[PDB]
Enzyme design. Structure first.
Site, mmCIF file in Angstrom:
data_model
loop_
_atom_site.group_PDB
_atom_site.id
_atom_site.type_symbol
_atom_site.label_atom_id
_atom_site.label_comp_id
_atom_site.label_asym_id
_atom_site.label_seq_id
_atom_site.Cartn_x
_atom_site.Cartn_y
_atom_site.Cartn_z
ATOM 1 N N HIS A 41 28.366 39.618 31.734
ATOM 2 C CA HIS A 41 28.095 38.605 32.754
ATOM 3 C C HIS A 41 28.418 37.198 32.286
ATOM 4 O O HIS A 41 28.598 36.298 33.099
ATOM 5 C CB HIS A 41 26.646 38.686 33.218
ATOM 6 C CG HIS A 41 26.366 39.882 34.077
ATOM 7 N ND1 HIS A 41 27.190 40.274 35.112
ATOM 8 C CD2 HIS A 41 25.342 40.767 34.061
ATOM 9 C CE1 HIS A 41 26.686 41.347 35.695
ATOM 10 N NE2 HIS A 41 25.566 41.666 35.075
ATOM 11 N N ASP A 89 26.423 46.020 30.273
ATOM 12 C CA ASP A 89 26.643 44.585 30.170
ATOM 13 C C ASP A 89 27.099 44.156 28.785
ATOM 14 O O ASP A 89 26.439 43.347 28.129
ATOM 15 C CB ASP A 89 25.354 43.845 30.533
ATOM 16 C CG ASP A 89 25.577 42.372 30.782
ATOM 17 O OD1 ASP A 89 26.727 41.973 31.022
ATOM 18 O OD2 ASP A 89 24.590 41.604 30.744
ATOM 19 N N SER A 183 21.604 35.025 26.042
ATOM 20 C CA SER A 183 22.245 36.233 26.540
ATOM 21 C C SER A 183 23.499 36.507 25.730
ATOM 22 O O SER A 183 24.242 35.585 25.414
ATOM 23 C CB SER A 183 22.582 35.956 27.987
ATOM 24 O OG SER A 183 21.359 35.804 28.692
ATOM 25 N N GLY A 184 23.733 37.774 25.404
ATOM 26 C CA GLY A 184 24.892 38.147 24.603
ATOM 27 C C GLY A 184 24.593 38.159 23.108
ATOM 28 O O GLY A 184 25.351 38.706 22.313
HETATM 29 C C1 LIG Z 1 21.322 35.495 29.847
HETATM 30 O O1 LIG Z 1 22.546 35.290 30.537
HETATM 31 C C2 LIG Z 1 19.896 35.115 30.354
HETATM 32 C C3 LIG Z 1 18.758 35.455 29.568
HETATM 33 C C4 LIG Z 1 17.450 35.113 30.013
HETATM 34 C C5 LIG Z 1 17.279 34.426 31.231
HETATM 35 C C6 LIG Z 1 18.406 34.076 32.017
HETATM 36 C C7 LIG Z 1 19.714 34.421 31.583
HETATM 37 N N1 LIG Z 1 20.782 34.081 32.347
#
Ligand SMILES: *[C@H](O)c1ccccc1N
Length: 228
Positions: A41, A89, A183-184
């Site tokens: 994403h 993902d 994230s990631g």
């Molecule tokens: C990762 O893209 C993430 C992690 C926690 C909360 C929101 C988001 N977008």
């Protein structure tokens, strides 16, 4: 990272900052000399930008001898990932060349045996994501230790309501949690990569909505295939 602490500079040599137009976008993890694993994403929110990977960093803006910004030769999102789901993902980024290894830059061994991490296991997640509700972005790497949460509890209606498949895992989120910008990034347990912070929007620090991480072990064949 919410409720965490600033990380020891370069103590996690596998940590990568996936960037879009010179700005930190998502965390990532060096899993081979020329490959960084992140979340799909993330590059969704790209396509119209230059994607690079910063390795050997602690501070995003300050010079450091080990810091190096690599261009990306190829971005490989998992073929089954979809914009509206949290499944598969994962994204693999092939750096323009093999990364210069050193004390501050080194791939992290990742889990290839498909067996769940035991509930309660303390795992480490690091990132440059927001550190509070206002959206404050830290200049340097933060991290937090989180205990793995059993899947059944994570799947309760009050929590994630059946969304956690066998390919996903959860960690507690009571005030301590990964958040936007993390994230990631990697979830490390016993010095081995076990999960990748999923990149679906989610509330942070609320124990009723645990952190969701994609189990790398569940995608060992795909990762092998892409790095082949
Ligand atoms: C990762 O893209 C993430 C992690 C926690 C909360 C929101 C988001 N977008």
């Amino acid at each position: 990272i919410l409720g965490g602490r600033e990380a020891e500079a370069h103590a996690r040599p596998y940590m990568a900052s996936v960037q879009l137009n010179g700005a930190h976008l998502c965390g990532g993890v060096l899993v081979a000399e020329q490959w960084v694993l992140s979340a799909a994403h993330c590059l969704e929110d790209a396509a119209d930008g230059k994607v690079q990977v910063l390795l050997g960093a602690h501070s995003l803006s300050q010079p450091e001898p080990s810091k190096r910004l690599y261009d990306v030769l190829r971005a490989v999102p998992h073929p089954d990932s979809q914009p509206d789901t949290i499944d598969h993902d994962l994204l693999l980024l092939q750096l323009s060349e093999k990364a210069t290894l050193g004390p501050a830059v080194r791939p992290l061994p990742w889990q290839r045996v498909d067996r769940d991490v035991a509930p309660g296991t303390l795992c480490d997640v690091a990132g440059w994501g927001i550190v509070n509700h206002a959206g404050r972005r830290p200049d340097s790497l933060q991290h937090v230790l989180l205990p793995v949460l059993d899947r059944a509890t994570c799947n309760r209606r009050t929590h994630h309501d059946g969304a956690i498949t066998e390919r996903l895992m959860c960690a507690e989120s009571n005030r301590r949690d990964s958040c936007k910008g993390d994230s990631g990034g990697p979830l490390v347990c016993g010095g081995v990569l076990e999960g990748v912070v999923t990149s679906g929007s989610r509330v942070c620090g609320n124990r009723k909505k645990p952190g969701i991480y994609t189990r790398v072990a569940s995608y060992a064949a795909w990762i092998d295939s892409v790095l082949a």
